[PDB]
Design a protein around this ligand. Structure first.
Ligand SMILES: O=C(O)c1cccc(N2CCC(O)CC2)c1C(=O)O
Ligand SMILES: [Zn+2]
Ligand SMILES: [Zn+2]
Length: 217
């Protein structure tokens, strides 16, 4: 397995990339973010595992940053894998109410703090959370960074294929993807979980793939 990767994407914004072999998928890359505010750091999705979450946190703490919190974009373990270890270290963990419920049903440890509704501020005017409706999973949310115009789409952004449909709502995904295109068309950078960073076009491509996936069912 390739090592945890951490790259500067923009000023105060980093992409972390972790890797896990998944049956019927091979080695799966997973992108998340670290967002820097003053001398504080926010995890946008945890890596797959506690070890890599520890590795990631250590890298930033070692640079003089405090980890103020982590937000998980959906319940799957490529977003939540690290919640246990963070909780154990009293670092505040965030996820939607839906996400927390699905983690519970799945017999997984939940995030300490939750939220619900359409729009949520994790940090006022710096880190916004938006729930477009079901798609890749019932609970998938996106994270918007206003200053830099960066959107983390998580596993909802699927420009070339929908990927793992095990917990997908193919019926709702096109509608959800339309609402996401309307609101965030002004994004400079769009960060998918499982493919590379693109511009606002990735929103359109996601919509087409959702529509195409529905037609096929
Ligand atoms: O979103 C995907 O397309 C995807 C691809 C490969 C592995 C995945 N998961 C990794 C985490 C594991 O808990 C379930 C599958 C996913 C996903 O559904 O997020
Ligand atoms: Zn997923
Ligand atoms: Zn995923």
């Amino acid at each position: 397995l390739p090592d945890l990767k951490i790259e500067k994407l923009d000023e105060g914004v980093y992409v972390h990339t972790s890797f896990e072999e998944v049956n019927g998928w091979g080695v799966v890359p997973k992108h998340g973010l670290v967002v820097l505010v003053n001398a504080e750091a926010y995890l946008i999705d945890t890596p797959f595992t506690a070890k890599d979450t520890e590795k990631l946190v250590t890298w930033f703490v070692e640079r003089g940053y405090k980890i103020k919190g982590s937000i998980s974009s959906h319940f799957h373990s490529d977003s939540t894998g690290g919640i246990e270890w963070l909780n154990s270290r009293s670092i505040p963990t965030y996820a939607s109410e839906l996400t927390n419920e699905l983690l519970k049903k799945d017999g997984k440890v939940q995030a300490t703090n939750s939220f619900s509704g359409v729009n949520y501020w994790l940090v006022k005017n710096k880190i916004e959370v938006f729930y477009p409706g079901p798609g890749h999973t019932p609970d998938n949310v996106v994270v918007w960074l206003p200053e830099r115009k960066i959107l983390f789409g998580g596993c909802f952004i699927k420009p070339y294929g929908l990927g793992n449909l095990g917990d997908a709502n193919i019926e709702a995904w096109p509608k959800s993807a339309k609402l996401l295109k309307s609101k965030y068309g002004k994004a400079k950078l769009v960060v998918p979980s499982h493919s590379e960073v693109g511009d606002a076009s990735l929103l359109k491509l996601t919509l087409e793939q959702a529509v195409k996936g529905l037609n096929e069912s």
